[model samples]
Target chain A: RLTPHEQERLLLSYAAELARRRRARGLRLNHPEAIAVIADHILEGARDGRTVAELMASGREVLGRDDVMEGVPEMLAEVQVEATFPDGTKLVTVHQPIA
Target chain B: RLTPHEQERLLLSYAAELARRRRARGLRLNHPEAIAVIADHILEGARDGRTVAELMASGREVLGRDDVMEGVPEMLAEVQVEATFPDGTKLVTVHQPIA
Candidate 1:
């Protein structure tokens, strides 16, 4: 059985990949897709050695207004995901990511 | 602007509704869908006066193996959602929900 942390990674990675595929296929972003897009950016930032503070500060850069469906930006007030960093696994939450 | 608490609820509610629509349309459950399904259950439980303990204990009943993709059950090690109960809002975390 996979460890809890590993499972969390698997889920988020899958979500991110799904979102990528959907976007590539020209699908508009919905709640799940929007969340996935945000998560993918955060996870990649963590893998690139960015700290939580940096990730939080860069929230606006993660998604553009056109990247999501109408009203999605305001709908997403926060996005939280467990990310693995050099230090350890941590919960990264960005408030008003699209604001 | 919605309060942080209200924003959380809106996001989760949207996720859950998306999952419901996907299921109705015959889309297989993926990571996002699986998370939504779990969150929906927890949120409903909270609204129904089920405490954290009772909700956690009923994880398996929330989703069947047939309800998700091949590896989604194992991929979800934990699920955390903020739910509003009669008392107030609380974060509910369930470990190994599909085990």
Candidate 2:
């Protein structure tokens, strides 16, 4: 349960950490792999836009998404919510729980 | 991030935890994906063999993998290791950084 701010914080921190490691290893964080680490947390948040910022926006969106966001597994695990209308029937929302 | 003892502990507990959830949902933990959940951590620990037990054995092996174990990415990250001999030079090993 991370807020948008928290999500970005985690994302940047993780990216920066990897960057630091790359420095020590004589590697460049600018490589294709750096994006992978960023993309991971971004996808975890189900970020909507193209880049990390969009992903942070996604984190905020999930915090506010009204739909029946739900699922199963790593890419999609058992994350969902149960919804009820003021009138009668019901709906379910799910999203895979964050790692 | 975990010791062999700890890795095995996580594997069994995660497996059982999923099993318990399946019980509540009237699902069977025996599904093929169940093994996947178990296998993820098993491979994280670098477990060997076909079963969880074999993977656990793998954990013990890494803790003791005398050679340079080492690479990049989720499926093949920058997890490599190195080796050195009394004769001279050195070898490098690598494995992708575990998320």
Candidate 3:
């Protein structure tokens, strides 16, 4: 468990995303909750030998719904989904345009 | 779905978590695969009006096997589980950890 302080930190991280997704168009990701779930896949993919990019690309393959992202997100090819975790907490690359 | 760029962002997010959980005995949570499965619940829980804390707390309840986590992990009650998604994911929230 985090030291109360960590909880606040994550809370803000989530809030920050919620705000970002609040834009006119973005995937209808469930925010804080989706964050944790996404984190899990990130781990499993690594264990089984899937590259970080493969994982996220696959994620978008299954999770992203352009119809809902408010007329599709901008930079459709250069989309980026930033998330925070307790560890390495950074960077996933995929194809010419990383996940 | 993302054109591709967005996919990498999510992938990076997952890798970062894998590095973190590789600790002495943090969590043996699965990587990539687990991410999607977990994401499903995150959405379901939100739709059903469950809080992020409840979803995570419950996930740990089912997935975390202290005995398997190297003589028990450092954080007990604070265990947070990360699962992946698929049709099978829902059947796990209570019935199996079970849906």
TM-score, A chain, model 2: 0.28
List the candidate numbers ranked by lDDT, top first.
1, 3, 2
Per-residue C-alpha lDDT of model 2 across residues A1-99, encoded as one tens digit per residue? 976544443444344343444445444333222333334434443422234334444433332111212211233332221222333322222333232
Give DockQ: model 1. Answer: 0.03
| lDDT measured at residue B35 in model 2 versus the true structure, 0 to 100 | 35
Q: Residues A1-99, candidate 3: write the lDDT tens digits.
A: 123443343444444445435533544544333443344445445544566557676655433443233323232443234334344445653222212
Candidate 1's residue-wise lDDT over A1-99, tens digit each?
976556455555556665665567566677776787788788889999999999987866777777777898899999988788999999999888775
Per-candidate clashes come to 0, 48, 35
**Winner by TM-score between candidate 2 and candidate 1:** 1
DockQ of 3: 0.05
lDDT of 2 by residue, B1-99 (tens): 123443343344345445546645755334332433333434333311234334334423331111122211224322221222333323322333223
Give Cα-based local distance difference scores for all models. 0.75, 0.34, 0.41
Off by over 4 Å in 1: B1-99
RMSD of 2: 18.7
Q: Kindly list the per-residue Cα lDDT of model 1 for residues B1-99, writing each as its tens digit.
A: 134444445556667767978878887789878888788788766655689889887755776667788898889988997777767878898777666
Best to worst by DockQ, what's the order?
A: 3, 1, 2
Considering TM-score, which of the candidate structures 1 and 3 is the better prediction for this target? Answer: 1
- The candidate maximizing DockQ is 3
